[PDB]
Design a protein around this motif. Structure first.
Motif, PDB file in Angstrom:
ATOM      1  N   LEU A  59       0.733  -1.179  -0.039  1.00  0.00           N
ATOM      2  CA  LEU A  59      -0.097  -0.044   0.078  1.00  0.00           C
ATOM      3  C   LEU A  59       1.024   1.330   0.002  1.00  0.00           C
ATOM      4  N   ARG A  60       2.080   1.113   0.462  1.00  0.00           N
ATOM      5  CA  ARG A  60       3.027   2.502   0.470  1.00  0.00           C
ATOM      6  C   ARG A  60       3.978   2.564  -0.556  1.00  0.00           C
ATOM      7  N   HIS A  61       4.269   1.253  -1.180  1.00  0.00           N
ATOM      8  CA  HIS A  61       5.612   1.290  -1.993  1.00  0.00           C
ATOM      9  C   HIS A  61       5.469   0.597  -3.413  1.00  0.00           C
ATOM     10  N   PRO A 117      -2.048  -0.202  16.251  1.00  0.00           N
ATOM     11  CA  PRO A 117      -1.981   0.799  17.154  1.00  0.00           C
ATOM     12  C   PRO A 117      -1.533   2.181  16.847  1.00  0.00           C
ATOM     13  N   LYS A 118      -1.058   2.428  15.649  1.00  0.00           N
ATOM     14  CA  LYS A 118      -0.717   3.784  15.068  1.00  0.00           C
ATOM     15  C   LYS A 118      -1.782   4.289  14.265  1.00  0.00           C
ATOM     16  N   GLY A 119      -2.835   3.640  13.841  1.00  0.00           N
ATOM     17  CA  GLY A 119      -3.854   3.963  12.752  1.00  0.00           C
ATOM     18  C   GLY A 119      -3.002   3.858  11.305  1.00  0.00           C
ATOM     19  N   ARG A 120      -2.114   3.004  11.102  1.00  0.00           N
ATOM     20  CA  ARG A 120      -1.730   2.756   9.901  1.00  0.00           C
ATOM     21  C   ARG A 120      -2.555   3.020   8.625  1.00  0.00           C
ATOM     22  N   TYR A 121      -3.627   2.184   8.809  1.00  0.00           N
ATOM     23  CA  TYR A 121      -4.775   1.890   7.367  1.00  0.00           C
ATOM     24  C   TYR A 121      -5.967   2.664   7.713  1.00  0.00           C
ATOM     25  N   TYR A 166       8.492  15.806  17.312  1.00  0.00           N
ATOM     26  CA  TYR A 166       9.652  15.102  17.639  1.00  0.00           C
ATOM     27  C   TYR A 166       9.897  14.249  16.474  1.00  0.00           C
ATOM     28  N   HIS A 167      11.141  13.976  16.299  1.00  0.00           N
ATOM     29  CA  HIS A 167      11.649  13.116  15.249  1.00  0.00           C
ATOM     30  C   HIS A 167      12.809  12.416  15.782  1.00  0.00           C
ATOM     31  N   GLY A 168      12.817  11.163  15.833  1.00  0.00           N
ATOM     32  CA  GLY A 168      13.792  10.120  16.320  1.00  0.00           C
ATOM     33  C   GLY A 168      14.744   9.810  14.984  1.00  0.00           C
ATOM     34  N   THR A 169      16.095   9.760  15.065  1.00  0.00           N
ATOM     35  CA  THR A 169      17.023   9.376  14.043  1.00  0.00           C
ATOM     36  C   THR A 169      18.361   8.841  14.454  1.00  0.00           C
ATOM     37  N   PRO A 170      18.958   8.117  13.897  1.00  0.00           N
ATOM     38  CA  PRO A 170      20.364   7.626  14.178  1.00  0.00           C
ATOM     39  C   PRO A 170      21.195   8.956  14.615  1.00  0.00           C
ATOM     40  N   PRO A 205      24.941  15.263  11.475  1.00  0.00           N
ATOM     41  CA  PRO A 205      25.819  16.344  10.595  1.00  0.00           C
ATOM     42  C   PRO A 205      25.042  16.835   9.370  1.00  0.00           C
ATOM     43  N   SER A 206      24.464  15.897   8.789  1.00  0.00           N
ATOM     44  CA  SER A 206      23.625  15.910   7.346  1.00  0.00           C
ATOM     45  C   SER A 206      22.232  16.822   7.818  1.00  0.00           C
ATOM     46  N   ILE A 207      21.725  16.441   8.775  1.00  0.00           N
ATOM     47  CA  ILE A 207      20.417  17.154   9.211  1.00  0.00           C
ATOM     48  C   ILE A 207      20.710  18.491   9.555  1.00  0.00           C
ATOM     49  N   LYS A 245      22.829  20.346   8.497  1.00  0.00           N
ATOM     50  CA  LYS A 245      23.333  21.214   7.355  1.00  0.00           C
ATOM     51  C   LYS A 245      21.731  21.503   6.292  1.00  0.00           C
ATOM     52  N   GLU A 246      21.156  20.149   6.033  1.00  0.00           N
ATOM     53  CA  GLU A 246      20.077  20.363   5.061  1.00  0.00           C
ATOM     54  C   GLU A 246      18.724  20.250   5.752  1.00  0.00           C
ATOM     55  N   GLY A 247      18.647  20.181   7.135  1.00  0.00           N
ATOM     56  CA  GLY A 247      17.211  19.967   7.530  1.00  0.00           C
ATOM     57  C   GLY A 247      16.560  18.453   7.354  1.00  0.00           C
ATOM     58  N   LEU A 248      15.436  18.190   7.751  1.00  0.00           N
ATOM     59  CA  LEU A 248      14.925  16.936   7.525  1.00  0.00           C
ATOM     60  C   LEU A 248      14.413  16.888   5.967  1.00  0.00           C
ATOM     61  N   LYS A 249      14.707  16.048   5.174  1.00  0.00           N
ATOM     62  CA  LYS A 249      14.230  15.738   3.889  1.00  0.00           C
ATOM     63  C   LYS A 249      13.251  14.522   4.065  1.00  0.00           C
ATOM     64  N   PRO A 250      12.482  14.442   2.936  1.00  0.00           N
ATOM     65  CA  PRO A 250      11.406  13.412   2.991  1.00  0.00           C
ATOM     66  C   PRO A 250      12.347  11.917   2.550  1.00  0.00           C
ATOM     67  N   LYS A 252      13.196   8.829   0.727  1.00  0.00           N
ATOM     68  CA  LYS A 252      12.593   7.977  -0.420  1.00  0.00           C
ATOM     69  C   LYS A 252      10.938   8.137  -0.283  1.00  0.00           C
ATOM     70  N   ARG A 253      10.507   8.823   0.934  1.00  0.00           N
ATOM     71  CA  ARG A 253       8.914   8.957   0.815  1.00  0.00           C
ATOM     72  C   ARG A 253       8.558  10.331   0.341  1.00  0.00           C
ATOM     73  N   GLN A 254       7.153  10.578   0.206  1.00  0.00           N
ATOM     74  CA  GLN A 254       6.705  11.884  -0.330  1.00  0.00           C
ATOM     75  C   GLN A 254       6.989  12.910   0.908  1.00  0.00           C
ATOM     76  N   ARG A 262      15.063   4.230  16.426  1.00  0.00           N
ATOM     77  CA  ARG A 262      15.687   2.650  16.838  1.00  0.00           C
ATOM     78  C   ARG A 262      15.377   1.881  15.485  1.00  0.00           C
ATOM     79  N   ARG A 263      14.411   2.096  14.652  1.00  0.00           N
ATOM     80  CA  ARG A 263      14.268   1.071  13.461  1.00  0.00           C
ATOM     81  C   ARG A 263      15.622   1.037  12.831  1.00  0.00           C
ATOM     82  N   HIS A 264      16.412   2.208  12.473  1.00  0.00           N
ATOM     83  CA  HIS A 264      17.515   2.418  11.840  1.00  0.00           C
ATOM     84  C   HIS A 264      18.847   2.137  12.246  1.00  0.00           C
ATOM     85  N   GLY A 265      18.965   2.230  13.706  1.00  0.00           N
ATOM     86  CA  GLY A 265      20.107   1.921  14.261  1.00  0.00           C
ATOM     87  C   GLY A 265      20.130   2.131  15.887  1.00  0.00           C
TER      88      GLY A 265
HETATM   89  N1  LIG Z   1      18.900  15.652   5.565  1.00  0.00           N
HETATM   90  C1  LIG Z   1      18.980  14.563   5.682  1.00  0.00           C
HETATM   91  N2  LIG Z   1      20.020  13.791   5.826  1.00  0.00           N
HETATM   92  C2  LIG Z   1      20.277  12.478   6.154  1.00  0.00           C
HETATM   93  N3  LIG Z   1      19.437  11.624   6.718  1.00  0.00           N
HETATM   94  C3  LIG Z   1      18.060  12.338   6.973  1.00  0.00           C
HETATM   95  C4  LIG Z   1      17.968  13.663   6.507  1.00  0.00           C
HETATM   96  N4  LIG Z   1      16.518  14.051   6.848  1.00  0.00           N
HETATM   97  C5  LIG Z   1      15.949  12.828   7.243  1.00  0.00           C
HETATM   98  N5  LIG Z   1      17.037  11.699   7.391  1.00  0.00           N
HETATM   99  C6  LIG Z   1      16.789  10.526   7.927  1.00  0.00           C
HETATM  100  O1  LIG Z   1      16.568   9.712   6.787  1.00  0.00           O
HETATM  101  C7  LIG Z   1      15.854   8.483   7.402  1.00  0.00           C
HETATM  102  C8  LIG Z   1      14.549   8.219   6.383  1.00  0.00           C
HETATM  103  O2  LIG Z   1      13.998   6.949   6.697  1.00  0.00           O
HETATM  104  P1  LIG Z   1      12.406   6.765   6.651  1.00  0.00           P
HETATM  105  O3  LIG Z   1      11.927   5.457   7.127  1.00  0.00           O
HETATM  106  O4  LIG Z   1      11.957   7.394   5.304  1.00  0.00           O
HETATM  107  O5  LIG Z   1      11.555   7.628   7.752  1.00  0.00           O
HETATM  108  P2  LIG Z   1      11.280   7.663   9.158  1.00  0.00           P
HETATM  109  O6  LIG Z   1      12.403   7.044  10.205  1.00  0.00           O
HETATM  110  O7  LIG Z   1      10.746   9.044   9.665  1.00  0.00           O
HETATM  111  O8  LIG Z   1       9.954   6.750   9.191  1.00  0.00           O
HETATM  112  C9  LIG Z   1       8.685   7.011   8.729  1.00  0.00           C
HETATM  113  C10 LIG Z   1       7.711   6.279   8.917  1.00  0.00           C
HETATM  114  O9  LIG Z   1       7.940   4.724   9.184  1.00  0.00           O
HETATM  115  C11 LIG Z   1       7.733   3.967  10.185  1.00  0.00           C
HETATM  116  O10 LIG Z   1       6.742   3.079   9.845  1.00  0.00           O
HETATM  117  P3  LIG Z   1       5.397   3.022  10.964  1.00  0.00           P
HETATM  118  O11 LIG Z   1       5.648   2.204  11.864  1.00  0.00           O
HETATM  119  O12 LIG Z   1       4.380   2.618   9.988  1.00  0.00           O
HETATM  120  O13 LIG Z   1       5.525   4.463  11.196  1.00  0.00           O
HETATM  121  C12 LIG Z   1       6.924   5.075  11.077  1.00  0.00           C
HETATM  122  C13 LIG Z   1       7.160   6.508  10.416  1.00  0.00           C
HETATM  123  O14 LIG Z   1       6.109   7.111  10.683  1.00  0.00           O
HETATM  124  C14 LIG Z   1      15.397   8.917   8.736  1.00  0.00           C
HETATM  125  O15 LIG Z   1      16.143   8.303   9.572  1.00  0.00           O
HETATM  126  C15 LIG Z   1      15.750  10.396   8.911  1.00  0.00           C
HETATM  127  O16 LIG Z   1      15.666  10.886  10.147  1.00  0.00           O
END
Ligand SMILES: Nc1ncnc2c1ncn2[C@@H]1O[C@H](COP(=O)(O)OP(=O)(O)OC[C@H]2O[C@@H]3OP(=O)(O)O[C@@H]3[C@@H]2O)[C@@H](O)[C@H]1O
Length: 179
Positions: free
Chosen positions: A15-17, A61-65, A96-100, A105-107, A109-114, A116-118, A134-137
């Motif tokens: 449904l997402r990809h 539990p998250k309202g995914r669908y 709030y946004h959790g990330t490895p 350092p990249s964030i 400089k560039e802020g949060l970018k989408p 691969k997602r929209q 924590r999913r990513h690291g």
């Molecule tokens: N400028 C930049 N440089 C480097 N890195 C960047 C970046 N700007 C951002 N980044 C990082 O790139 C990762 C993308 O990972 P990506 O999986 O697309 O995003 P997210 O981690 O936000 O997850 C979304 C949904 O996925 C789960 O599934 P769900 O349980 O259904 O809901 C949850 C949740 O809502 C992420 O680490 C982000 O910081």
DNA sequence: AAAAAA
């Protein structure tokens, strides 16, 4: 628990990809027919039924669908363009946004970018943000985002899930703290 | 990789 998570993860993939890998075509709002999804899921797990999928949707539990009649979609997380109709979050002061930590350092400089997602995904909830990172690291930092900084630059925030919020992007000037 | 599992 175990069978539901597997079917639920496959649902998220379809449904997402990659709906086209299963012969499905989402409409502009991201919906596919419910019977089509069941038939798609059955080519991997032949015991899946319409009632079993309806269960997963009502208990997520998250309202995914979201189901509207005989149509179903994921509410967020897409990597293909969808025209979503979520209400705007006008009340949150902080998000709030959790990330490895390796991404910081990249964030900065560039802020949060989408990526691969929209959309960029954030949360109203600190625990949910940290568990998502924590999913990513293993080593994760919690980013605090000034939501009103975002609205002032024109980036409106939408209520995509219970605690999940989506926004076009998060400029670095709007990230107030990294913890 | 809530982006299947092999
Ligand atoms: N400028 C930049 N440089 C480097 N890195 C960047 C970046 N700007 C951002 N980044 C990082 O790139 C990762 C993308 O990972 P990506 O999986 O697309 O995003 P997210 O981690 O936000 O997850 C979304 C949904 O996925 C789960 O599934 P769900 O349980 O259904 O809901 C949850 C949740 O809502 C992420 O680490 C982000 O910081």
């Amino acid at each position: 628990k175990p069978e539901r998570k597997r079917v639920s993860k496959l649902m998220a993939y379809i449904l997402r990809h990659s709906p086209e890998e299963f012969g499905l075509r989402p409409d502009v709002e991201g919906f596919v027919s419910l019977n089509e999804l069941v038939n798609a899921l059955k080519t991997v797990y032949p015991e899946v039924t319409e009632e079993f999928v309806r269960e997963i949707v009502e208990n997520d539990p998250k309202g995914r669908y979201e189901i509207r009649g005989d149509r179903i979609r994921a509410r967020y997380g897409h990597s293909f363009p969808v025209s979503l109709d979520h209400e705007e979050d006008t009340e949150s002061r902080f998000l709030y946004h959790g990330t490895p930590r390796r991404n910081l350092p990249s964030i900065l400089k560039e802020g949060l970018k989408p990526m691969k997602r929209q959309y960029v995904h954030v949360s109203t909830d600190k625990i949910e943000a940290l568990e998502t990172g924590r999913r990513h690291g293993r080593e994760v930092v919690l980013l605090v985002i000034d939501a009103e900084c975002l609205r002032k630059r024109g980036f409106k925030i939408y209520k995509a899930g219970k605690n999940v919020r989506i926004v076009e992007r998060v400029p670095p000037d709007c990230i107030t703290l990294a913890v």
